[PDB]
Curated annotation (Swiss-Prot):
Biological source species: Saccharomyces cerevisiae (strain ATCC 204508 / S288c)
Annotated coiled-coil segments of the chain: none
Domain of life: Eukaryota
Biased composition (Basic and acidic residues): 61-74
Purpose: General activator of RNA polymerase III transcription.
Part of the whole protein covered: 257 to 340 of 594
Name of the protein described by the UniProt record: Transcription factor TFIIIB component B''
Region (Disordered): 61-84
Length: 84
DNA sequence: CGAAGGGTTACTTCGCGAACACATGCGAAAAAAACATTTTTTTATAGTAGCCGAAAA
């Protein structure tokens, strides 16, 4: 739902939320948060896009059968982006 | 009669003090040399960076 202190110390906290049981260790949103929204949200996104970037590098490296020349082809593509 | 050898007074620039108590060798280019890294041969061992599948809705 949103960030709100539902309950604690009595049962599974449910005042304004979508939780219905205890042992919330799995995903660990439980009560509410009011600290570091966007700078901590856009960190796993950056990590995930860099991992997909390295995976598509590993996929492109199958075609050109030269590893370090594929790395120089990558930096040649990014300096084509630089001249763009 | 005129150029030259001391001889001094005159203008300018450099050395000290101001009470008497109280309680607050240094820096910077390089150069011979004693020296470690860095290996690769495993290799026992835990896990810690990073990677997809069987599980739930």
């Amino acid at each position: 739902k949103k960030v709100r202190d539902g309950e604690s110390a009595k049962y599974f906290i449910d005042e304004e939320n979508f939780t219905m049981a205890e042992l919330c260790k799995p995903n660990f949103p439980i009560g509410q948060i009011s600290e570091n929204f966007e700078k901590s949200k856009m960190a796993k996104k950056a990590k995930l896009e860099k991992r997909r970037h390295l995976r598509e590098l590993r996929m492109r490296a199958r075609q050109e059968f030269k590893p370090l020349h594929s790395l120089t082809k990558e930096e040649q593509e990014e300096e084509e982006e630089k001249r763009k």
